[PDB]
Amino acid sequence: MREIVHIQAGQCGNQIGAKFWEVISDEHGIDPTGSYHGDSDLQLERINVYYNEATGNKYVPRAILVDLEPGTMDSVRSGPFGQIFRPDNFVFGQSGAGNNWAKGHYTEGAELVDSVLDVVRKESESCDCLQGFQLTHSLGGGTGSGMGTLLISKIREEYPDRIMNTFSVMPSPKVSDTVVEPYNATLSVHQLVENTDETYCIDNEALYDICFRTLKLTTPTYGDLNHLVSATMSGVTTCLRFPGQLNADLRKLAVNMVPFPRLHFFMPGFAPLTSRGSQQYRALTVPELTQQMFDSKNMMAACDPRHGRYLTVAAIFRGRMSMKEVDEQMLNVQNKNSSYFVEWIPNNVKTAVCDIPPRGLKMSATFIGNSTAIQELFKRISEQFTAMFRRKAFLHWYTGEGMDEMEFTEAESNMNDLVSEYQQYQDA
Amino acid sequence: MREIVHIQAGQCGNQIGAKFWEVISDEHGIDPTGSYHGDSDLQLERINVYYNEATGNKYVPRAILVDLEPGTMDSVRSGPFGQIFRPDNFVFGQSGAGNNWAKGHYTEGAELVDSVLDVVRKESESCDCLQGFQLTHSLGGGTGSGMGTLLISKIREEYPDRIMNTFSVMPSPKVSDTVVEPYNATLSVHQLVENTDETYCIDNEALYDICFRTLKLTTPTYGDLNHLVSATMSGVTTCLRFPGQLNADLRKLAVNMVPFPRLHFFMPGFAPLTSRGSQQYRALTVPELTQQMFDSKNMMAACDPRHGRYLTVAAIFRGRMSMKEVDEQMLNVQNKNSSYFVEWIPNNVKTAVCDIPPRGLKMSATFIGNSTAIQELFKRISEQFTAMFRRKAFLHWYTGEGMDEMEFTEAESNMNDLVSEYQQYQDATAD
Amino acid sequence: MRECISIHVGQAGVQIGNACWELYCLEHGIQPDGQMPSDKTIGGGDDSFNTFFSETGAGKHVPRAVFVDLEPTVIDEVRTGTYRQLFHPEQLITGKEDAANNYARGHYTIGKEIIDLVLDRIRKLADQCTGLQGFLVFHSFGGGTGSGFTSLLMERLSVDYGKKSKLEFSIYPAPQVSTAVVEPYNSILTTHTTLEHSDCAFMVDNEAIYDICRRNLDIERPTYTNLNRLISQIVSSITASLRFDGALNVDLTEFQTNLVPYPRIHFPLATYAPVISAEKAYHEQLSVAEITNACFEPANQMVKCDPRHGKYMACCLLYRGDVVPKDVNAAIATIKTKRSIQFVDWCPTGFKVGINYQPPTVVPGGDLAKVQRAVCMLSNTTAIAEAWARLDHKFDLMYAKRAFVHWYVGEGMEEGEFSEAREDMAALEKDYEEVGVDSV
Amino acid sequence: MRECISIHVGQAGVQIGNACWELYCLEHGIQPDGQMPSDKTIGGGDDSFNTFFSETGAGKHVPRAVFVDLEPTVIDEVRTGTYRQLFHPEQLITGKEDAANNYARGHYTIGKEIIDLVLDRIRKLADQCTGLQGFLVFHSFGGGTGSGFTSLLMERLSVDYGKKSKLEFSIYPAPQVSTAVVEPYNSILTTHTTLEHSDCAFMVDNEAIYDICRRNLDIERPTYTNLNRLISQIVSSITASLRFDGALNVDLTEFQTNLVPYPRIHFPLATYAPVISAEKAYHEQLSVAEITNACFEPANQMVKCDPRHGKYMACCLLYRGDVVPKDVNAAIATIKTKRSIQFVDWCPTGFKVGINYQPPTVVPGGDLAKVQRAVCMLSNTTAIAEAWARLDHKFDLMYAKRAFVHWYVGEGMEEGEFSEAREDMAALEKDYEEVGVDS
Ligand SMILES: Nc1nc2c(ncn2[C@@H]2O[C@H](COP(=O)(O)OP(=O)(O)OP(=O)(O)O)[C@@H](O)[C@H]2O)c(=O)[nH]1
Ligand SMILES: Nc1nc2c(ncn2[C@@H]2O[C@H](COP(=O)(O)OP(=O)(O)OP(=O)(O)O)[C@@H](O)[C@H]2O)c(=O)[nH]1
Ligand SMILES: Nc1nc2c(ncn2[C@@H]2O[C@H](COP(=O)(O)OP(=O)(O)O)[C@@H](O)[C@H]2O)c(=O)[nH]1
Ligand SMILES: Nc1nc2c(ncn2[C@@H]2O[C@H](COP(=O)(O)OP(=O)(O)O)[C@@H](O)[C@H]2O)c(=O)[nH]1
Ligand SMILES: COc1ccc(/N=N\c2cc(OC)c(CCBr)c(OC)c2)cc1O
Ligand SMILES: [Ca+2]
Ligand SMILES: [Ca+2]
Ligand SMILES: [Mg+2]
Ligand SMILES: [Mg+2]
Ligand SMILES: [Mg+2]
Ligand SMILES: [Mg+2]
């Protein structure tokens, strides 16, 4: 049955997670009360990947909602699709994490973590062929960053052979809540390097630039940012939700996308870039879809791919289109940018097609790249970490929760190594 | 409920003491029988500080009347507001003191110092929250000089953490009562330097001079001298009797005026001094009040403030004026006279305002200064003392009571140090 | 939920408490008898204003507040004032004899007689909280109670409540309104004694407030009533984040993480705009850009100091009323250029913004004009050390001669506690020096 | 009579096995429910098709087949398809999770747990055989199951059935259709492990079948259905000798005697002609000489190589349809002179010829047109070593940087098995060079 168990933790993780369920529910013909009201059998062929079948022919998402404060919990329970969520899958505290990784990972999160693990199991217990876990969170706060990584460590201990995949939102000074966001991010990236198999780097800096530079949105909101996120999450999970010539799962994804274990951070890309209302009166030729997908202005992570090299690429075209012209246009790209693909991994670009497009678009394209250019992201966070840590500024917010400086030193040393490893294959 | 217990001792003590109660009684709207006949609620807000409530809406002063002789006490009982006082709080003897400090401190005053104490305890115990004691006396006589300081010492033993405030009258030969007055004064100043927290120096020489020169009074009597004292006691106690903060009580005054324990002798000033002269055109303004208030001619002490420096100063204006003008004028005096203010005590001049002016004055201004120039007053006593002691004049008056010459030279050398201290801080700099 | 208890100590703390709670009521629609017709949940609820107001079964909304003073005259006015029915009597605590402008009496001689009772009352309030967040402490630096008793209370609060956060709204002494000569002494003593027990302190320089009331409000001779009405506006702006909700409203605890880079460096500088009289407000409306620029005028600051002679480590802008983000962004952009905002090299040069949508209120008969939008800027700048230097220097002038020191030693204190307090002040001044130095 | 059991492993093996068994039925007259009106001995017999079909008392004809996949979505198709009635539930073995395109996972992790079950289900089939000849194993090179599990199966089959023949039908990986980046890894690993356990292996390169489908059938984007329906035509031509009366390649041992003189060099090239689009309503009927000559055209080979630049070791010609010998001899006489056919000196230069009078059957609704004569040429030429060279080079590019190796080491396989397989591959390449290279 290849079931997937979804977890969303913290404010960011629960707002992007709720948008994800609202988007793919629509695509699978489910309504806010969990009853199927669609027209295609393709919508239900792999519905059990993300949904449990309720007693009375309704579908409930295999999702667990986690937070250290009830604020965002209630915003979801009051949203459009808030009623489709199993009421017993809401685990929350009252104290909050104060944008503090330490509180989320060591002190406040320490007491909620079993309540969360109790639901994961109940939910995994009901899985016929559990495939792995999928987690949504930001890295710049405390609950999703600190507790989120604590859950990953907890879950891997009990399911050491299931696949662990995360949608992780990187912080950026252009959309910042607090100044300690680099501290929170660096400590989390060290966890992710060790404890997950696949991480989608969703960069708030990139999301901001797309909204302000391309979409012409003067004062972008998290709703605008999150519209890009859900479109990306829809596309990047298309191969798991619908049947195709390639019946993909998380493990097959990992075995073909990650050549070296630590290098498991992917750049997502999406085309066409649309806005809230949008309009889409002119459809896009596959040549346009393909050329947009690979431009830096369509990257969901602020990295210039030309500054690096693609180790492995994975692309999906959605809608009624000539699979021949998709093949032609994709092979024309590899030849137009041959020097941005490593030559020691033959045939490292794989493309798939699915005739079911997302809501409000005649055709689209999504793309994951395992590219050495991702090193620019980690470098940017590293430089901001160091400017503060050099003077031990704001450290008292963490040492007052039992943390030592050595932990920070350790965390950054491991992230500079990761930058080095990426640099090592840029010159091959 | 910040009660003060008032004590009057001796002729001067009861004289100026009687006029004090006359004046503040008229300000708070209390008649000679103790009924309230005023018009403003501000008169009864702090009435408890100086008056007890008596069953039936009577207001009795919290005063104790004391003297080694019945003369003055019969008279205070027959003047205005004589019936206001509690007849129990009259404590008089009969042997008298003969203007001899030794008799009031060791022998005669001793026989009577217990009776006075029982009345103090009775009044003190009846206080919601006792504040301190204020004593009106003289330093030249025998009773208020000798036994007044004996009382201060006895009260301090039982109330060691309360405030001890005195209105001490200095002797001047222009109003001379007796020749031995420099002895009594020195022996008293030695007690006041050690056993009181704050002493107002009401100087008979300064009072006589105001009446002669300014008020143009050829034959100034004790009644004329005392109208000046009563005007001073009225203003110097204004911030204790009416709503408002800043020196609202005796301890806050002590903390803000006494930078070193021994230097607790204040120079009072008053304006307008022309209480009943013959030059009209007064047209008193905030600027003129400030100017006059800091002039040697307006000081109830024979010292020129420009011969020393102010450690601290407290000024209170009464009447209807613009606060901003007072502020500006008070600033203009400090700036224009900066050389006469120690630089090491920052913001050492505080100003208070009260809406209620004194009886018969559109506006007045009272001044309390802690100035090193006061050593002029102590120097005058010392050299008059030394003129007698050098020749051992009249010592038998005191040795016959048991005193020894060491007691004289002790008080002598102590007051020499007091002058030395004031000079030390006059020359101290901030760099 | 996440309740804050407020504690008002001494005259200044009590009278500022008056101004604040009167304003809170007019901002939430609470009447002087504690009834809130808009509140549809009787006896309780988890509304944002419940962080500061509890609820009885009769629908009364009672401030989570304790007033304390070592003498009754000031609290007696609350007990018989317009809002006498808002508080239970047990919330108003008074002694019979105050500190006499003496730290020693506030911390020991007199204060020790009433401390237990004050803590017992605070406990009562705390037991009614589902998630106590911390305490707000209002006091003066210069008074005997405001310094001495506050320090004693601060120390006891750390014992009974551990690391639960304590914020200070302190009054810094100014000569135009000072009531005691020894106020520098009391100031340094309480500052040294509370530094390690306080997570954040908002200093209000009485001279800054006095001069603003004079220039901006056209008040010839400001009184405590004038100063206090304007202070409560600053306090209302800072606490509004916890008493209101909104899509763009940011919690003060979030700013707290940005405002305090090291434990001892927890003194933010507050600016408020617009401070305008009705006679002048009528005519000119004030845009977001206009009020934002006013926040970088030295003349509008709560503490006298020149921020262009220092370096910023944090800048928070707390807008309130008719304000949309597009305007704020435009304003900062221009400010960033026409101004000299210099940040230390170890922290990002950004402006943290929060926008409450509940517009500002004015007490009837106040001197401030009613405006459609306002802003309070909270910034951590090394420039505030100037206020430390000035206060420290007045201390040095007196202590060199040991002036007035006998009033403290006579109460039990030792000279060593003066040099100790001063040594601390000296380190604090060096601490501000060091955070501003550039990195290697 | 001697029996053959077919084993289908992985997705490619199962889906190709489906296409073949469907074809077998259309060719022999077996209906989708197992009935055979042509067959007159009910529930018994010793006819030539009994080598692939057993009989029940009720007249049902059952394929001697076994389908094994580590995941059920592909075998469920067989279990609910058109010929579902043809198979017994025990003939379909499905697992829980697949090999994840990981040879290691297929051979070591999932393999250790399913091997015994599969061997038992085969034992049941064998027990029903009076004189089993051996096995035909269908699988892909690149799949984790097709490569990882298959090699372990071949290892055990050699133990359980020593004197039996093992024949292979292997799908060689092509990027146009490949699904994983590590398929070169899986190809080298399984080739090294099966080499000693396979007697003869027919490689089909998906690149060749793909282009034949676009060039000759006019299919823009060929899918597995197109690809597979053509592969089963070749497979059917190869196995027709076992299911029909004849004298050439009548048992799995002749396939080696006639095509494999060196054991290690057991990869014959398959060429097939004519491939004609069923959308061509009118087409000229190619002659024996014309279709025979097309056998030496590169475009028609199952693997894209150049036989002109190699040597021959054995050439088999298998015609189906209207072919009299006289025409074949005439065709061979010409192709000798014109074309460049050079045999190894240690071998006779000639051709073994087999003619089956029944012409090729085409699945109705398929892509291929009905023809009156077709030919499959099986030739053991050193030219096929080109495919080993390209595959070995792709292996070398990745293994040089140790890319993706951690996936295999994490299943318990040790890294040294990689170079041990590569060392074997390098030996194979040199074996080909020596058999047919000159100064
Ligand atoms: N802004 C402001 N400052 C005040 C107020 N009341 C007093 N102050 C200032 O506070 C200082 C004196 O402290 P207070 O609060 O009066 O004294 P306290 O804390 O009651 O202390 P004690 O009277 O000695 O027991 C001086 O600097 C005054 O100017 C007020 O209502 N507002
Ligand atoms: N000709 C042909 N090739 C196929 C078919 N299915 C898969 N392939 C090819 O075989 C390789 C993948 O092997 P599969 O059979 O899909 O894999 P598997 O044996 O199921 O292995 P796992 O999925 O890893 O358990 C790729 O080169 C595919 O292109 C098919 O039906 N026909
Ligand atoms: N894209 C996006 N980023 C968000 C969102 N909410 C918060 N963030 C970012 O996440 C970080 C703060 O983490 P948050 O989820 O608020 O904290 P937590 O509740 O402690 O996990 C900052 O970098 C924010 O900019 C959101 O809805 N969308
Ligand atoms: N101003 C003033 N001084 C007085 C008065 N009566 C006495 N003195 C002074 O008091 C001193 C003598 O003390 P006195 O009170 O007569 O004697 P005692 O009763 O023994 O203390 C002399 O310097 C007198 O001038 C009076 O009514 N007013
Ligand atoms: C090495 O290159 C590969 C990457 C992956 C993959 N495995 N199958 C996939 C492929 C997908 O990308 C194209 C997706 C949709 C992402 Br737009 C997928 O679900 C996430 C699984 C197989 C590969 O050969
Ligand atoms: Ca309520
Ligand atoms: Ca038969
Ligand atoms: Mg947040
Ligand atoms: Mg006499
Ligand atoms: Mg007070
Ligand atoms: Mg499979």
Author numbering:
A (entry chain B): 1 to 42, 45 to 360, 369 to 438
B (entry chain D): 1 to 42, 45 to 360, 369 to 441
C (entry chain C): 1 to 440
D (entry chain A): 1 to 439
Task: Share the article's original sentences.
Here, we describe a multi-reservoir, high viscosity extruder as a step towards automation of sample delivery at XFELs. After commissioning the device with lysozyme crystals, we collected time-resolved data using crystals of a membrane-bound, light-driven sodium pump. Static data were also collected from the soluble protein tubulin that was soaked with a series of small molecule drugs. In two commissioning beamtimes at the SwissFEL Alvra endstation, we validated the general performance of the multi-reservoir extruder and determined 13 structures overall.
Here, we exploited serial crystallography data and associated data processing methods to identify a low occupancy ligand at room temperature. We acquired data of tubulin soaked with a structurally unexploded photochemical ligand SolQ2Br, which is expected to bind the colchicine site. Here, we used the T2R-TTL crystal system where there are two possible colchicine binding pockets available since the crystal system is formed of two copies of tubulin. Notably, the two sites can exhibit different ligand-occupancy levels and we thus refer to these as sites 1 and 2. We noted that for site 1, the standard omit map does not account for the apo structure revealing ligand binding and the refined electron density revealed the ligand binding pose. However, for site 2 the signal level of the positive difference density was not significant enough to confirm ligand binding. The increased sensitivity of these difference maps allowed observing ligand binding not only in site 1, but also in site 2. Furthermore, we extrapolated the structure factors of the ligand bound state to full occupancy using the software Xtrapol848. Consequently, we could model the binding pose and infer the occupancy level for site 2 as 25–30%.
